[PDB]
Nucleic acid binder design. Structure first.
Ligand SMILES: [Mg+2]
Ligand SMILES: [Mg+2]
Ligand SMILES: [Mg+2]
Ligand SMILES: [Mg+2]
Ligand SMILES: [Mg+2]
Ligand SMILES: [Mg+2]
Lengths: 199, 190, 175, 138
RNA sequence: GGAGCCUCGGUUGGCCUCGGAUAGCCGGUCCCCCGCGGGGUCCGGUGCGGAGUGCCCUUCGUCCUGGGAAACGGGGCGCGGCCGGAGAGGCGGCCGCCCCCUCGCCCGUCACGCACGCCGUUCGUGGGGAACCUGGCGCUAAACCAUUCGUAGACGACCUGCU
RNA sequence: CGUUCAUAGCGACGUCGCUUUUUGAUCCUUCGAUGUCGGCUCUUCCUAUCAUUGUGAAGCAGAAUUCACCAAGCGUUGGAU
RNA sequence: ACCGAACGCCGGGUUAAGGCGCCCGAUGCCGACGCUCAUCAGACCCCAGAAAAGGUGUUGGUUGAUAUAGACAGCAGGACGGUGGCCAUGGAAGUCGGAAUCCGCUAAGGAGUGUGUAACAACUCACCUGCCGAAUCAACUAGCCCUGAAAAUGGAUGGCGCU
RNA sequence: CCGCGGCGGUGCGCCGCGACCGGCUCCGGGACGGCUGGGAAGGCCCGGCGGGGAAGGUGGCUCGGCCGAGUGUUACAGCCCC
C-alpha cells in the first residue's frame, strides 16, 4: 500500500510532478536516496540557480523569510510542495502523505523500491546534455552530511550484496530442485504452459 | 545534419596489448599500464583483427560536434600507446637575466623547490602528478627533465612549474624569466 | 494557406470569354494544398500574379487531385522555393527524399517552418522535380544513396513511459 | 557494440501501430527515420514505415535493395522465416503472453490449483536440498 | 477475560543487489589470484528482458467417509537457548522439549436455514483513544508556591541555600 | 590625433542605445490637508569601482600609470566660509 | 476597455476564445518533422520590454572560384634587374605622402603588403616545386543561440519546475 | 367478513426491475456511387527494345576459414531496377 521510489537517477522536477499527483490522490509516497536525484542543465547553472534562491530573503527579519533547506531530501520535498495546493487543508494533508529521505534508512532499505521511468534521466535527457547531482549541489550550498550519508550507504550496500548472494543461491537451488523433480510435477507444469506461463 | 556513419582506425603496434572494458581502454606494454575511461564520449570502440592489430572507433548518426570526438578519442589512444612504448620526456629550460633559478628535486621526482627566482625569498615548492618524475638533467646547464607515461599528467606538471615561476606587477616583455617548456620528446625513440 | 498533409492538385482555368476574345487560352498549374477549396484559391493567387486574371473575370475549368504514379518507389525530389524572410524575399533549392511529390512538398513546408520560421503563407513552390541519384546536390540526401546501407538504432530511448508509470525494473536502451 | 542493423533485407518485428505483431522485411531505407518496408507472407503491404515502431530481429534475408515484392516473397519462403520465427524464444514468449490474456475464469482456477501443488512439490525439494547441503558443510 | 462511548481510514501480500545505458543478466569454471565466499580469464546460455513488477507469492466456502497421486509437514498467540540487526534497529532468523493433528492435487460420498431475484457483504481488527470488572509480579514522587540568595533582575524569569 | 601607426590612449562628420541620482513635458492619485529645505542621527540596498583582493592593457624598463575584467567583502575622514 | 460570448431559475448534451507535466478540468497519444544549450536560455494579441552593430557557436540558403595540366592550408626555397624610376631634397633608390605605373629576365617577383630606416641595409609579404593524400575556399544572406545588456527591500514565463 | 373482483386516486421509509417514447453520445455490421469510368499493386507469363545501379563476374588490396567477408574499376545480364 505504499510507493517507495528510488530517487536515484531521476529528474528533480519530473519526479516531483509524478509524486505530487499521487500524493493528492491519497497514495502514501516515500522517496528515498534523494541525493541521487539529478537535475538537467550543467552543474554551474544549477548552483547559481540555488545561490539566487538563497539571496531571496525577507530584508527586515530574515528569520521569517524563505527557509532555504540545504538537505537534498528537503530540497526535493520543497519542489514537491511547489506542485501542491499547500495552503489548503487538502494540500497539507497531501504533503503529510509524502516522506522523503537523504540516503535510504532502515524501514525502506529492506523494501523493493520502484523507479519512475517517465522521470528517469536515461530516458528524458539526450546523452550529450549535462546535468547536476543534487547531492553535490546540496553539499556546496551548505548541506553538512554528505560524507556521513555516503559511509552509511557503503555499509548498506555491503549488507545488501550479502542478501543478494543468498537470494541467488536459493534461486539456484530452486532451478536444481525443478530438475530433480520434473517427472512428478510434469502434468502440473504442462498446464502452466497451456494457459501461457513458463515460456 | 546527422552523418549516417563516421569512423577511424588506430593500428596498435605488436609490442603493445590494448584491451577495452566496454568503453574504458587499458593499454599495457614495455613501460606499464595506462587506463582511460571514455564513458562520456559515446562511441563504438571495436577492437578487430587476429593478433589484435587495430582499434576501430565508430560513431553513428553524429552531428558536427559529436563527430569531432571520434578523432580525439583515437588521438588520446595513440598517446596512450606511445606512453606505454616510448614514454614522454618534456624538457624545460630555465631563463633569467640575473637571478639564477635554483631548482632542486626532493622526494624522488615529486617535489620541485624553485629558489631565488627574481631574488624572491619565497621558495616555490611544486608537486608533480602521480607517476610523473621530475629530474635535473646533465649535458645542459639550466634545464629540467619531466618523464612519464601519461602525457596529460606530464604536460600539466610542466605547466605547474611554468606558471609557478611567473612575474607579477612588471613588464613581462622585459622580465623574461622562469622555467619554460623547450622540447616535448620521448624517453626512447627507436 | 495552412497545412495538414498536402495533395497535388491540377487546376486549369481561363479568363472567361467575351465578344472580342471568343476562345481564350487555358492555363494549368500544380497547386499543393490540403483540399480542393483552397487549391482553387491558391490557383487564382498565382494566376493573378502572372496574368491579368482574377477569380471574377475567369472560371476554373478543371480542378482535380493528381496521384503519385510511383508511390512505392523511393525518389529524390528537388524543389525550388521562393520564401519571404523577415527581411527580403529569397530563392532556395531544397532536396527531399520521399515516396510522393505531395509528401515531399509537405516535408519542405515543415522544414521551412523549422529552419527559417517561414510560415506557409510566405512561401511559394515554383517547381518540384523528381531527380536521379546524381543531380543531387545535398549531402543530407546523398548519404542514403548507397546499395549496402547499414546502421544501428543505437540509444533506442523507450516510449510507453506510462505503461508502468511505476516499476521495479530500470529500463533498457540497448537492442 | 551493435549486433542488429538496419540492413536491406533485415526482418523486423513491428512493435505497435496498425500492423502490430507482424514481421516485415526492410526493402529500402528512405531517410534518417523512415524505411520502405514489406511483409508479403506476413500480410503487410509495401509501404513506408517509421523505425520508431519497428524493432528488429536477427534475420537478414537476402534480396536486392529495391526489388518488386515477388522477389522478397521468394526470399521469405526460401529461408522459411515464418517457421524460424515461431521456433525462436521471442515468438514463444509472445505466444505465451497472448495465451495468458485469453485465459478464461475456469482456466484461471485450474492454473491456480495446479500452481498451488506444483510450487509445494518444489518447496519441499528445496528445503531438503538446503538441509542436505547443510550436511555437506558439516 | 466481559461489556461500552468515541475517532476513523482501509477491504491478500511482495522480506532489499549494485548499477549500466554506444550495454547488460545468468551460469560454470577445466585454470589462476584473494579473504564457504570475493576478483579474474576462458567457455556455454539468455537479452524487445519468462531467474520477466507485461512479474512473483498466497487462495476464496464448512464438514463427513474411503480411494489414488503427493507425504513428516502443520499447529498449540506451544514452550526454553543461541544468533544477526543502531541510520529512525524494531524486526527476523537459527537450535532443544511437551502435547495434538494428516492439512496441498485428483477422484468418488453426502450433508451444512435452500431464508423463497435486490444495498452498505467480505478483512487489516484483539484497530487508535476515553471510561469500566479479574489474576501474577513490581513500585514507593517530584514540580510549583512560600522562604532564602545576588553570579540575576522593570515585573515575570534566572543562579543559589534550607535535620 | 597619437614623431611613425585609424583603434595603447583617443576620436570628428554621422549613427544606435540605456538611465531616471538633472530639468522639463504631463496632470492619473491626493485640496472633510500624505507636515512643506537643509543639517544632525541610524539602517539597508545599488554599482555606473575612488581604495583594497585577484587579473588581462599599454605609447608598462623601474617608480609612477592610465585602459579594461571578476567584484559592492571592507572602507571612503577632521575642519574654515 | 483585449479575445470569446452578452445573463429568468434548473437537468443532459455541444462548443467558443483559450487550454491539457503538477498546482488545475484535459495528451498517462508509443503523436509527426526539424531547430536550439545559453557562467542573463526560452516560453503566446492588447502586454508590461530592447537597438545599431558583431560572432567558423550551430543550421540552412544564394552566388562565385580552383583543382590530378596535380590544389588548399602545413612543414620550407627565391623575392631580381632596366633603376637613386619620377614628383617630392626634409629625406622615400618599393616603402612620411601623391601623378604613376610598363618592359627585361622570365619560373617569376608589385616600379611594391608591411617591419623598420634621416636614407639604405636587413627582414617580411607571388610563380613553382618535395613530402603528404580529397575535397578545398571565398563573399554574401537568413533561422535559433550568444556579445552588445547598468539600480537601488528579496522576486517572479503566474508559481513549482522543465532540456 | 372474504374476495386485493372492476375503476379511481396512493405508496410510512429505503430500494430495485421492466418495456415504451423524447433528446444525446458512442460501438459493431453490412450494401452502393464517382474519379486519370480512380492511381499504384498483386498473379500468370510470353515476345521484343534500349538505358542505369551495379554482379552468380573479374581485378588491385585487405580480413577470416579453393570458400566466406570487406573495399575498388569497366560495365554485358546469368541480382535487380527503369
Ligand atoms: Mg548557517
Ligand atoms: Mg610599474
Ligand atoms: Mg596621422
Ligand atoms: Mg504621515
Ligand atoms: Mg561592473
Ligand atoms: Mg476581432
Amino acid at each position: 500500500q505504499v510507493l517507495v521510489l528510488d530517487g536515484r537517477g531521476h529528474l528533480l522536477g519530473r519526479l516531483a510532478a509524478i509524486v505530487a499527483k499521487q500524493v493528492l490522490l491519497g497514495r502514501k509516497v516515500v522517496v528515498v536516496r534523494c541525493e541521487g536525484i539529478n537535475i538537467s542543465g550543467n552543474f554551474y547553472r544549477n548552483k547559481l540557480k540555488y545561490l539566487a534562491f538563497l539571496r531571496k530573503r525577507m530584508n527586515t527579519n530574515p528569520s521569517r523569510g524563505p527557509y532555504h533547506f540545504r538537505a537534498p531530501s528537503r530540497i526535493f520535498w520543497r519542489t514537491v510542495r511547489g506542485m501542491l495546493p499547500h495552503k489548503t487543508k487538502r494540500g497539507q494533508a497531501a504533503l503529510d502523505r509524502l516522506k522523503v529521505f537523504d540516503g535510504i534508512p532502515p524501514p525502506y532499505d529492506k523494501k523493493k523500491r520502484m523507479v519512475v521511468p517517465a522521470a528517469l534521466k536515461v530516458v528524458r535527457l539526450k546523452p550529450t546534455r549535462k546535468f547536476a547531482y543534487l547531492g553535490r549541489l546540496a553539499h556546496e550550498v551548505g548541506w553538512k552530511y554528505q560524507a556521513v550519508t555516503a559511509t552509511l550507504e557503503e555499509k548498506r550496500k555491503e549488507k545488501a550484496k550479502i542478501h543478494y548472494r543468498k537470494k541467488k543461491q536459493l534461486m539456484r537451488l530452486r532451478k536444481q530442485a525443478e530438475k530433480n523433480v520434473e517427472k512428478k510435477i510434469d502434468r502440473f507444469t504442462e498446464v502452466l504452459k497451456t494457459h501461457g506461463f513458463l515460456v | 545534419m546527422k552523418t549516417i556513419l563516421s569512423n577511424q582506425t588506430v593500428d596498435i603496434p605488436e609490442n603493445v596489448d590494448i584491451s577495452l572494458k566496454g568503453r574504458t581502454v587499458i593499454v599495457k606494454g614495455p613501460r606499464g599500464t595506462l587506463r582511460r575511461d571514455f564513458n562520456h564520449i559515446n562511441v563504438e570502440l571495436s577492437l578487430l583483427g587476429k593478433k589484435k592489430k587495430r582499434l576501430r572507433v565508430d560513431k553513428w548518426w553524429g552531428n558536427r560536434k559529436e563527430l569531432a570526438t571520434v578523432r580525439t578519442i583515437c588521438s588520446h589512444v595513440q598517446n596512450m600507446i606511445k606512453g606505454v612504448t616510448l614514454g614522454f620526456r618534456y624538457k624545460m629550460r630555465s631563463v633569467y637575466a640575473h637571478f639564477p633559478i635554483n631548482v632542486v628535486i626532493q622526494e624522488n621526482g615529486s617535489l620541485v623547490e624553485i629558489r631565488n627566482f627574481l631574488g624572491e625569498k619565497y621558495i616555490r615548492r611544486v608537486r608533480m602528478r602521480p607517476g610523473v618524475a621530475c629530474s635535473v638533467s646533465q649535458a645542459q646547464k639550466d634545464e629540467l627533465v619531466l618523464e612519464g607515461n601519461d602525457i596529460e599528467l606530464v604536460s600539466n606538471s610542466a605547466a605547474l612549474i611554468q606558471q609557478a615561476t611567473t612575474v607579477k606587477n612588471k613588464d613581462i616583455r622585459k622580465f623574461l624569466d622562469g622555467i619554460y617548456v623547450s622540447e616535448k620528446g620521448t624517453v626512447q625513440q627507436a | 494557406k495552412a497545412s495538414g498533409t498536402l495533395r497535388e492538385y491540377k487546376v486549369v482555368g481561363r479568363c472567361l470569354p467575351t465578344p472580342k476574345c471568343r476562345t481564350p487560352p487555358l492555363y494549368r498549374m500544380r497547386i499543393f494544398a490540403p483540399n480542393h477549396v483552397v487549391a482553387k484559391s491558391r490557383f487564382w493567387y498565382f494566376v493573378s500574379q502572372l496574368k491579368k486574371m482574377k477569380k471574377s473575370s475567369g472560371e476554373i475549368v478543371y480542378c482535380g487531385q493528381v496521384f503519385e504514379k510511383s508511390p512505392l518507389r523511393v525518389k529524390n525530389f528537388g524543389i525550388w522555393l521562393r520564401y519571404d524572410s523577415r527581411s527580403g524575399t529569397h530563392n532556395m533549392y531544397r532536396e527531399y527524399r520521399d515516396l510522393t511529390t505531395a509528401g515531399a512538398v509537405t516535408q519542405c513546408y515543415r522544414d521551412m517552418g523549422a529552419r527559417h520560421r517561414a510560415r506557409a503563407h510566405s512561401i511559394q513552390i515554383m517547381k518540384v522535380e523528381e531527380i536521379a541519384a546524381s543531380k543531387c546536390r545535398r549531402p543530407a540526401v546523398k548519404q542514403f544513396h548507397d546499395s549496402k546501407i547499414k546502421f544501428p538504432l543505437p540509444h533506442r530511448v523507450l516510449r510507453r513511459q506510462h505503461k508502468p508509470r511505476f516499476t521495479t525494473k530500470r529500463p533498457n536502451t540497448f537492442f | 557494440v551493435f549486433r542488429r542493423f538496419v540492413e536491406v533485407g533485415r526482418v523486423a518485428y513491428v512493435s505497435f501501430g496498425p500492423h502490430a505483431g507482424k514481421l516485415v522485411a526492410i526493402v529500402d531505407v528512405i531517410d534518417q527515420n523512415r524505411a520502405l518496408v514489406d511483409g508479403p507472407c506476413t500480410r503487410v503491404r509495401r509501404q513506408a514505415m517509421p523505425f520508431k515502431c519497428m524493432q528488429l530481429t536477427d534475420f537478414i534475408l537476402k534480396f536486392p535493395h529495391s526489388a518488386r515484392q515477388k522477389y522478397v516473397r521468394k526470399a521469405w519462403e526460401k529461408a522459411d522465416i515464418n517457421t524460424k520465427w515461431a521456433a525462436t524464444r521471442w515468438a514463444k514468449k509472445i505466444e505465451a503472453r497472448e495465451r495468458k490474456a485469453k485465459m478464461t475464469d475456469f482456466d484461471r482456477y485450474k492454473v491456480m490449483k495446479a500452481k498451488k501443488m506444483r510450487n509445494r512439490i518444489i518447496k519441499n525439494e528445496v528445503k531438503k536440498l538446503q538441509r542436505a547441503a547443510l550436511l555437506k558443510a558439516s
